[PDB]
Amino acid sequence: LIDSKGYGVGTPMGSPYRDKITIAILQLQEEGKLHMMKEKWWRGNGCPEEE
Amino acid sequence: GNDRFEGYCIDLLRELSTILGFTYEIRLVEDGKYGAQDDVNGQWNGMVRELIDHKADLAVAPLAITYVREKVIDFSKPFMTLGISILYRKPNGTNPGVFSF
Amino acid sequence: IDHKADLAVAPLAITYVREKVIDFSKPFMTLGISILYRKPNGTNPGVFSF
Numbered sequence: 001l002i003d004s005k006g007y008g009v010g011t012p013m014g015s016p017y018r019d020k021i022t023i024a025i026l027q028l029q030e031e032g033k034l035h036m037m038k039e040k041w042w043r044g045n046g047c048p049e050e051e
Numbered sequence: 052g053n054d055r056f057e058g059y060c061i062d063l064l065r066e067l068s069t070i071l072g073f074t075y076e077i078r079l080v081e082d083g084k085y086g087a088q089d090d091v092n093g094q095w096n097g098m099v100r101e102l103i104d105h106k107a108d109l110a111v112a113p114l115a116i117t118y119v120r121e122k123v124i125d126f127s128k129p130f131m132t133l134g135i136s137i138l139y140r141k142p143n144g145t146n147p148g149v150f151s152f
Numbered sequence: 153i154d155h156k157a158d159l160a161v162a163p164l165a166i167t168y169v170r171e172k173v174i175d176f177s178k179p180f181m182t183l184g185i186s187i188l189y190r191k192p193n194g195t196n197p198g199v200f201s202f
């Protein structure tokens with residue numbers, strides 16, 4: 001990796017939701033749902049080199 | 052409706068709707084950009100323009116946290132980590148090695 | 153919480169429970185939980201391995 005960055009639900013400048021989205025992301029991450037959704041989409045065909 | 056879409060950031064937005072409690076209208080951004088301050092005058096494009104102008108409430112999309120976007124909108128705290136990396140073809144040849152023995 | 157501090161510059165990992173009582177900044181280092189264990193002591197094939 002060249003740098004380290006990250007995504008994020010963008011809210012307008014001073015919205016009251018960014019302190020409620022932050023809670024509702026940290027809740028999903030400890031429950032393992034942010035990994036459960038990523039394994040549902042980013043897998044696809046698990047390409048081998050098989051040979 | 053909202054039933055037109057699928058994917059990661061649609062399944063994320065369902066889970067944010069269940070926990071916090073709201074209804075949501077997923078609207079495609081009209082520009083097709085995300086955010087870019089045009090250096091000739093200074094103006095935003097895409098989603099970051101539609102959050103400064105308060106035409107949106109959330110921006111659930113691959114909207115990477117950068118230094119310049121954070122001074123004009125407020126991001127949440129990351130739902131996915133990453134970095135810039137090089138994409139290139141696999142080399143489809145084999146090393147001959149005639150002295151392989 | 154008792155306002156005896158202003159910053160908490162330390163390895164204070166962002167968790168769900170700490171975020172509801174204090175406000176973190178946005179991460180200066182990324183990580184995860186991982187297993188620490190000894191290396192297996194290695195191979196040492198003898199010189200009379202044949």
Ligand SMILES: CCCCCCCC/C=C\CCCCCCCC(=O)O[C@@H](COC(=O)CCCCCCCCCCCCCCC)COP(=O)([O-])OCC[N+](C)(C)C
Nearest residue numbers: 151152189190191192193194195196197198199200201202
């Ligand atoms: C199919 C082809 C067969 C052909 C020959 C068959 C004949 C019999 C052949 C070999 C018989 C050897 C006995 C078996 C030993 C068992 C293993 C052992 O103990 O290893 C010991 C090795 O230390 C040695 O014992 C080395 C001795 C080599 C013998 C020389 C071969 C015969 C010479 C030519 C004969 C013709 C001469 C012409 C007329 C004079 C040490 O144990 P280790 O833990 O395994 O070592 C690792 C530890 N370390 C690294 C610190 C050391």
Ligand SMILES: *[C@@H]1O[C@H](CO)[C@@H](O[C@@H]2O[C@H](CO)[C@@H](O)[C@H](O)[C@H]2NC(C)=O)[C@H](O)[C@H]1NC(C)=O
Nearest residue numbers: 188189190191192193194195196197198199201
């Ligand atoms: C695996 O390696 C460890 C690390 O060396 C071995 O344990 C000790 O090794 C030190 C080396 O400085 C000795 O001073 C100690 O006396 C060793 N402890 C003992 C012998 O109880 C360990 O023996 C190795 N184990 C295996 C199965 O290879």
Ligand SMILES: O=S1(=O)NCN(C2CC2)c2ccc(F)cc21
Nearest residue numbers: 004005006129132179180181182
């Ligand atoms: O853009 S951030 O919010 N802050 C910067 N960093 C760490 C410095 C690498 C990271 C590291 C991982 C992320 F997911 C997000 C960020």
